[PDB]
Design a protein around this ligand. Structure first.
Ligand SMILES: *[C@@H]1O[C@H](CO[C@@H]2O[C@@H](C)[C@@H](O)[C@@H](O)[C@@H]2O)[C@@H](O[C@@H]2O[C@H](CO)[C@@H](O)[C@H](O)[C@H]2NC(C)=O)[C@H](O)[C@H]1NC(C)=O
Lengths: 49, 48
């Protein structure tokens, strides 16, 4: 009926605690917000189901 | 400024609907810097 809800901090996965990597990750724009948006849409649906 | 202003920026909107909204993950920042090196003191023989 449902599966485990997961959230990710895309910046902590990719760059965890590096400010240098975090400034380089901003060059990609929206991708990390899209990843968090997609996992949030999956997580809300486990409760709906 | 406050959690509502962060919600407005995360939604890129000056108005927000009824809901619960994911905002930036928090993090306890470091209080001080700790350096730990061996108590070796004698300089290395590079002239030789
Ligand atoms: C390698 O030698 C340099 C310079 O050549 C020597 O200069 C005199 C000190 C004397 O020994 C001559 O026979 C050599 O030709 C060293 O450079 C000196 O370093 C000291 C600090 O250690 C500094 O106060 C001096 O001003 C420097 N003098 C000059 C002329 O540069 C250098 O330290 C040696 N390299 C290593 C890795 O030990």
């Amino acid at each position: 009926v449902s599966m485990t809800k997961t959230s990710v901090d895309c910046t902590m996965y990719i760059c965890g605690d590096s400010t240098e990597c975090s400034n380089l990750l901003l060059q990609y724009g929206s991708f990390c917000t899209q990843l968090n948006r997609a996992l949030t849409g999956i997580a809300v649906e486990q409760d709906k189901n | 400024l406050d959690p509502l202003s962060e919600t407005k920026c995360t939604l890129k909107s000056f108005t927000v609907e009824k809901g619960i909204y994911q905002t930036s993950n928090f993090r306890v920042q470091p209080t001080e810097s700790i350096v730990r090196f061996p108590n070796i003191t004698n300089l290395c023989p590079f002239g030789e």
